Amino acid sequence: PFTPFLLGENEIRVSGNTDLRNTNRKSIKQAEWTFALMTHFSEALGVNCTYCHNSRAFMDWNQSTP
Amino acid sequence: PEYQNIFNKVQVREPAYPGVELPKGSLPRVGKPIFSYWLGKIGDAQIGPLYLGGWGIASLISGFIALEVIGLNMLASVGWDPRLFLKEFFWLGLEPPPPAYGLSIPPLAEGGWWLIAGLFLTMSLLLWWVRVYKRAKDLGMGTHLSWAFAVAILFFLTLGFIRPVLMGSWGEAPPFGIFPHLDWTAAISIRYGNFYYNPFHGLSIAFMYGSAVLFAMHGGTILAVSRYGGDREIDQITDRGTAAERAMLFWRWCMGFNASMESIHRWAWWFAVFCIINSILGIILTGTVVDNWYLWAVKHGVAPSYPSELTIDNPYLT
Amino acid sequence: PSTGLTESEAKEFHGLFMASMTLWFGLVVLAHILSWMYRPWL
Amino acid sequence: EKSTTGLTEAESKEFHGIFMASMTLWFGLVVLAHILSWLYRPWL
Amino acid sequence: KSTTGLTEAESKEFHGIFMASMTLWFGLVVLAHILSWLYRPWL
Amino acid sequence: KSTTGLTEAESKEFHGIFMASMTLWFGLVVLAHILSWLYRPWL
Amino acid sequence: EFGYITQYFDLAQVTLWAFWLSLLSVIFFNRREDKREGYPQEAVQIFGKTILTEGFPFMPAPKTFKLPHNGGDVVKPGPERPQYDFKLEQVDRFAGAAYRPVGNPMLAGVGPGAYAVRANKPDLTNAGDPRIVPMRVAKHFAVVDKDPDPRGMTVIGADGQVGGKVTEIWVDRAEPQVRYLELEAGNKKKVLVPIALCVIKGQKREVKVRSINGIHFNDVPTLSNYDQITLAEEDKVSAYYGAGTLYATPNRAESVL
Amino acid sequence: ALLNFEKKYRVRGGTLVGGDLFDFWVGPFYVGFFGVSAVFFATLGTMLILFGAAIGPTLNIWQISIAPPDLSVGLGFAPIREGGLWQVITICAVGAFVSWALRQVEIARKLGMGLHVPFAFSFAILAYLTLVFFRPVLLGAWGHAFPYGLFSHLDWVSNVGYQTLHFHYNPAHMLAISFFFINTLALAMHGSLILSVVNPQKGEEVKTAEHENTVFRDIVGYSIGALAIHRLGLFLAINAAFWSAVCMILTGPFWTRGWPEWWMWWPNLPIW
Amino acid sequence: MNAKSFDGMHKLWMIMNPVSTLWAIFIFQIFLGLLIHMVVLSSDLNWHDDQIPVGYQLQGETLPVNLEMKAA
Amino acid sequence: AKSFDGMHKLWMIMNPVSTLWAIFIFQIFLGLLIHMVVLSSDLNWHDDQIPVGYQLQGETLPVNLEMKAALK
Amino acid sequence: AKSFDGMHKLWMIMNPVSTLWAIFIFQIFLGLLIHMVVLSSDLNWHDDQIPVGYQLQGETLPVNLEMKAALKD
Amino acid sequence: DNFTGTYKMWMFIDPRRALLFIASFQILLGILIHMIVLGSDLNWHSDGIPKFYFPNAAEASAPIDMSPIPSARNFKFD
Ligand code: BCL
Ligand code: BCL
Ligand code: BCL
Ligand code: BCL
Ligand code: BCL
Ligand SMILES: CC(C)=CCC/C(C)=C\CC/C(C)=C/CC/C(C)=C\CC/C(C)=C/CC/C(C)=C/CC/C(C)=C/CC/C(C)=C/CC1=C(C)C(=O)c2ccccc2C1=O
Ligand SMILES: COC(C)(C)CCC/C(C)=C/C=C/C(C)=C/C=C/C(C)=C/C=C\C=C(C)\C=C\C=C(C)\C=C\C=C(/C)CCCC(C)(C)OC
Ligand SMILES: [Ca+2]
Ligand SMILES: [Ca+2]
Ligand SMILES: [Ca+2]
Ligand SMILES: [Ca+2]
Ligand SMILES: [Fe+3]
Ligand SMILES: [Mg+2]
């Protein structure tokens, strides 16, 4: 996941901003590439997902940590 | 203590039973029946014979072509080495086409083998459906086992064919692996905002828990009255004995209502089928109607709201 | 007679089966001629 | 003792005659299809 | 004793035809490989 | 006592043909390996 | 804007309502099928009068089982055969009080020793033969060696005393397996014991029957003909052994702690 | 109300505690000492859940939540408004569940039958106690247990799962899921088969045991038997519960990395 | 021997079932045929995609009609 | 040297038919396995591009080259 | 020197056919296992490129080199 | 000849089962070879001969796996 994300400049976000079907066209494969990069963030610092997220909404900034 | 009836202490043999006579015009049964002492410690010891007619051969040709394809692609992914195949076996898989190809037929090493294996597995399961139906109907029985099988086939086709077509991409379907298909499960939950806030997912979990509860309860109750001949359910249904009476008093006294020896089997049927019906309904709406299950749950007054105390600044707004 | 049909019954069935199959294939050919006229694929 | 299908030798001869005729006709049609395909889109 | 019910005459008959068929099959295989070597040699 | 129903004459017969067949098979294996060594030596 | 809303009503909502209504309706049908046995129930009134009530939802209309080999029709819910003659005394003067047996508790047919009133015909195979039979009538069965043959062993009876000796095994021809052991008792009668109430020790060559006592094997119910057993007789035998779980010793029905 | 056949079975005796004082029925229910206990504890627990909802922000059914203490309380005693209510309710819950099991034992003794059902219930109880008692004690704090709320214990489940980066690769989790899935399949087949044999094709007789064996030997080649399928059922459900308890006692106390990294013992065997 | 060593070989079918053997041979041959064709198609010897004697997708992309339509 | 005299008596305790079937099946499995193990090593003979690379041969045919020029 | 006299009586309590089958199957499994264990180490003899590397030999044939050259244009 | 008595084959092999095997196998093999040839360069449905009939994308890249779901239909990727 480093070639598209840490040298190239691709969008990491995959989730929508409303609840029903809208203009979002990302796929499950893009979600997998994001999941891979996040796994590396966790390993490189010695932490879990919950060091920066609340898993019940991985996309909300008002429910993240500082 | 007292005998618990979990293993057979004394075994007995007679010559093998060939089976109830079939209607005239049928093929013979293939195989000579053998006996297993270890299988007889816990159940019936006879293995075979088997019935192979028209539909169960077409099935088994389809299924084995599919298996050969899946196995060979997993093996090509390590460079044909069987040592590496055994070493890294849970990480291998056959992957779907890249999502940019849409619903077209892609080249063979970039998703076409996935498409072939999917088609052959589908045909295999539909031919098996016809076999199950005809086998039960030729012996003169009700066809209840075909209805439940139909539900299961429908769930296999929903995730895999119907949802990918309604979305516009074959790359939305699971791959054929062990760890690869677990990764698919997690990713589809992450992309469509948290399956815990999908209500059909909650209802199917309710019915899977309930299946385990109900079958522990039934298995216990019939082993507990097998000293009064309770394991013979057909006779207890058509001539109620003391085993059925005790079995229904137990539950009536314990929780206030009961079923009968025939009705509990309808409860079993339905608890196993509602699980999968809700599975279909929950997958078919994801992506095609709802894009974020958590935001849906918030709009309909379902999600709790933890206290905040802080303010985090969205850096895309700055 | 593993199906219980005699030889006369088999002859009868065969007659009508072959007629029906020929008619079906005729209709298939007609459909393909129309499709070739509308959108030739080779 | 031995595995049998109940066919006599005359019935087997009859079945064999028609089986071989049918297989030959099928293979003839296959050859024709491949000649047409080679004329249209040669693959080797 | 494990037995197939075939006598010795029946076994001789079966063996004759089995060997003939296997020889014909292997002949066809050899022919296919000669053609393939002429078209696309692999070694 | 575990027994196969074969007498000693039947066992002698079976053994004769078994040993002949195994020897022929191993001969063919040796020939295949000599060809492979000539084409692509591995040690 | 992260949580903007366009429209409140959607399809997921309607579909969820439809499911709530499709459940809530199989409950109805299953609860109605639950009441083809044991109903109408008997409600006791303010001063002892008993009426028949039927519950919620009401009982279904009767259906018919057609039994094989001209074994008759069974309508359900339908009539009932008459109870036998149990005697009981209530302990406390209210409808929800318990009962005590009046005579000898072992020979009373109340409590865990109650039984049902079934047909006086044997259960049949698919060919029309009786299903449960002794191993001398079924001449093709054999006990698998590797397993202790119980024929010959003794029948110790839960207080250490001897009950009798095993003389026959009763098998099940439809599903090959052991169902009963036949034994000769202390007064030289032939009585049966279900195989699911026997612990068989091969080396001691004993069968331990924890249910009843040694002297209790003399009063086990007997059969009419010893080449077959009927549904009624199965019930009687099994129920007699089940009465001992509470009546064998006077201390068995008496609050562990 | 009593069933048609019920009166001859309502005798006294069979109890564990108490004696003749609580040996009666109320309607269809049987009460006993443990019946009184169970209803007492259920009522108290329910009322405390409701009060903990009253002091919260909402009485919406989906958004009620009562949470355990903080991790700084350790294995001590928390204030009522910040964790102690959760502790009292979790005492009531244990009391009610064990009472339920012992009442079952009394009933089965009275009717003359075996103790298989309370024994299978014991494994559900064991899984609950693993989540609220054993795992918290081994990790050193009550605040490792889940809060009481629909939708709010699901947030717990989610975050605990992601504390190991990918919880699908937990081995005992895989084994338990295997048992759950196979149990639903078996229950569908058993239900279908009995219904099919007593509800045959229109205008036919009820079928027999031979038909039951034949159908599955025709389709699949092996039939397990009418008494062994009940055994197989008790077995699959109990094993599901057991391996769930193991998988949770492994996570945290005995493994703190990601779960994919455990599996690394396999491709590192020096034999390939 | 060396010449009379394989004399009684025809007796083989008194201990080996002919029907089972026939079915096994046929099924094994079909499975092996599929396997070898798939293994050779996944190598450098592939004969469907090698663009010999001509590439057909490339041939279709450069037809004058398609070129003139793509030009607009 | 007379230590292996009674060896022929082996077939009075070991079943000949079972042994034959076991040997045949094991030999086929081992054949497939060794071919796959050697093909996945440096000795691979299908993909080694000897005596020539065929995909590369198809990419540089004059017809394909002239078509790829007119596209680009 | 006289401790192992009655050893031949072993076959009066242990079944010879079962023992033979067990030995044969165990030996085949162990043969496969040791070959796989040695192939996965530094002693591997199929991939060590001795006495020559054949993939490398194929990549640098003059015909393949000349075809790869005419593609860079 | 050597093949004089081949017709006796059907005295121990069931001709009904033989027919049921052969029909099934041939139909399945037909489907298989068609799908294999369609997933290659010999494909004849979307090859643009004698004409491309669909409104295809004007610039379609070579699709990779890290891709989004397409907005419109397209069948010309090469
Ligand atoms: C570009 C491609 C063309 C196209 C090219 C072709 C070609 C080529 C063929 C068809 C054929 C069919 N097409 Mg078309 N077809 C197109 C678009 C459509 C659309 C649509 C929504 O766009 C539909 C609904 C159809 C539907 C049909 C069916 C009528 C027919 C397949 C019948 C079948 O499967 O029998 C299977 C069922 C049986 C065999 C059962 C046995 C007989 C039964 C009892 C009688 C059924 C009658 C039958 C349907 C015909 C009735 C017509 C009457 C004689 C008047 N096509 C497009 C426009 N289509 C096939 C056909 O017409 O067959 C003659 C055919 O060869
Ligand atoms: C570029 C490649 C070519 C192509 C190259 C070939 C080649 C090469 C062959 C085919 C063959 C077939 N092709 Mg084509 N084919 C093309 C495009 C198509 C398309 C399409 C949508 O584009 C279709 C639907 C078909 C369909 C067909 C079938 C008619 C036939 C397969 C028969 C079978 O499956 O065995 C079914 C077999 C059985 C059930 C057993 C034996 C049959 C017996 C006698 C009873 C069945 C009834 C009847 C005879 C069935 C066939 C109908 C005809 C009369 C043959 N092709 C393209 C243009 N095709 C095969 C063929 O022609 O067979 C003669 C064949 O060899
Ligand atoms: C680069 C590689 C070459 C190639 C190299 C080879 C080589 C080498 C061989 C084949 C063989 C076969 N190839 Mg090729 N093959 C290629 C491409 C193809 C393609 C294709 C779509 O591209 C197809 C469909 C085939 C199909 C076939 C089958 C006919 C045959 C496997 C038969 C079998 O498995 O019998 C299994 C079934 C049985 C044993 C049962 C009995 C046989 C039945 C009764 C008849 C089957 C067909 C028969 C042999 C031919 C018809 C009869 C004769 C005309 C008299 N090849 C390419 C071009 N192929 C093999 C072969 O032909 O041997 C004869 C073989 O050795
Ligand atoms: C670099 C490696 C070399 C190579 C080196 C070797 C070596 C070394 C050997 C083989 C052997 C074989 N190779 Mg090679 N081989 C290569 C590439 C191939 C390719 C291919 C698609 O590329 C194929 C299909 C084969 C296929 C074969 C089989 C003919 C044979 C395996 C027999 C077997 O398993 O029987 C096991 C099954 C049984 C014994 C069942 C019993 C059935 C009876 C006895 C009849 C079976 C017939 C039998 C298969 C062949 C006899 C041939 C006849 C005399 C014509 N090789 C490459 C070029 N190959 C082996 C062999 O030659 O055996 C003598 C062998 O030792
Ligand atoms: C991101 C989150 C992770 C995840 C994180 C976890 C965590 C964390 C846990 C599990 C646990 C489980 N997971 Mg998981 N799990 C995930 C994905 C899955 C998937 C899937 C398809 O993806 C499946 C099928 C499962 C399945 C399972 C089960 C193996 C297990 C739950 C059963 C159980 O605990 O029974 C045990 C039964 C009980 C605890 C019930 C207690 C019963 C009590 C005694 C009786 C109550 C009566 C009541 C009060 C009375 C009401 C009365 C009214 C009158 C009616 N998980 C994802 C990857 N999973 C749980 C587990 O294993 O715990 C042991 C667990 O803690
Ligand atoms: C709470 C309160 C306000 C109390 C006041 C009332 C007072 C004062 C006292 C009452 C006395 C007492 C002690 C009451 C305790 C009871 C109370 C209050 C609550 C408990 C009720 C309760 C726990 C019910 C839960 C019911 C549920 C959801 C069950 C789940 C499983 C389920 C859906 C089962 C349906 C299928 C059934 C009926 C299975 C049972 C069943 C099985 C499993 C067989 O195998 C079998 C085999 C052969 C014949 C019959 C049967 C059979 O009936
Ligand atoms: C080395 O091995 C050999 C070759 C010797 C054989 C051994 C085989 C082995 C070891 C196999 C191992 C297999 C494993 C581990 C498989 C794992 C499988 C799992 C867990 C799969 C899970 C999910 C997959 C799903 C749900 C797939 C669903 C696919 C569907 C529904 C496909 C639909 C496609 C269709 C209907 C075709 C449409 C095509 C067309 C032509 C219409 O498009 C236009
Ligand atoms: Ca080519
Ligand atoms: Ca080469
Ligand atoms: Ca080397
Ligand atoms: Ca075209
Ligand atoms: Fe049941
Ligand atoms: Mg993946």
Residue numbers in the entry:
A (entry chain C): 199 to 264
B (entry chain M): 2 to 319
C (entry chain P): 5 to 46
D (entry chain R): 3 to 46
E (entry chain T), F (entry chain V): 4 to 46
G (entry chain H): 2 to 258
H (entry chain L): 2 to 273
I (entry chain S): 1 to 72
Q: What does the paper behind this entry write?
A:
Based on the work on Tch. tepidum LH1-RC, we have examined the LH1 complex from a spectrally unique mesophilic purple sulfur bacterium, Thiorhodovibrio (Trv.) strain 970; this phototroph shows an LH1-Qy at 960 nm, the most red-shifted Qy of all BChl a-possessing species. As for the thermophilic Tch. tepidum, calcium ions were responsible for this ultra-redshift; removal of Ca2+ resulted in a blue-shift of the LH1-Qy to 875 nm, whereas the subsequent addition of Ca2+ restored 960-nm absorbance. In addition to the large redshift of the LH1-Qy, the special pair BChl a dimer in the RC of Trv. strain 970 also exhibits a red-shifted absorption band at 920 nm6, the longest wavelength reported for all BChl a-containing RCs (which typically range from 865 nm to 890 nm).
The cryo-EM structure of Trv. strain 970 LH1-RC was determined at 2.82 Å resolution, and its overall structure draws both parallels and contrasts with that of the Tch. tepidum LH1-RC13. The LH1 subunits of strain 970 are uniformly distributed around the RC forming a closed, slightly elliptical double cylinder composed of 16 pairs of helical α(inner)β(outer)-polypeptides (αβ-dimer), 32 BChls a, 16 carotenoids (3,4,3′,4′-tetrahydrospirilloxanthin), and 16 Ca ions. Structures of the Trv. strain 970 RC subunits are nearly identical to those of corresponding subunits in the Tch. tepidum RC with smaller root-mean-square deviations (RMSD) for the integral membrane protein subunits (L and M) and larger RMSD for the membrane-associated protein subunits. Cofactors in the RC include four BChls a, two bacteriopheophytins (BPhe) a, one 15-cis-carotenoid, a menaquinone (MQ)-8 at the QA site, and a ubiquinone (UQ)-8 at the QB site. A unique feature of the Trv. strain 970 LH1 is that another histidine residue (His48) in the LH1 α-polypeptide, a residue absent from other purple bacterial LH1 α-polypeptides, also participates in hydrogen bonding with the C3-acetyl group of BChls a in addition to Trp47 that is conserved in all LH1 α-polypeptides. The additional hydrogen bond between His48 and BChl a, together with an interacting triangle formed with BChl a–Trp47–His48–BChl a, further strengthens interactions between the pigment and surrounding polypeptides and stabilizes the conformation of the BChl a molecules. Six copies of the α1- and eight copies of the α3-polypeptides form two groups and align on the two sides of the LH1 ellipse.
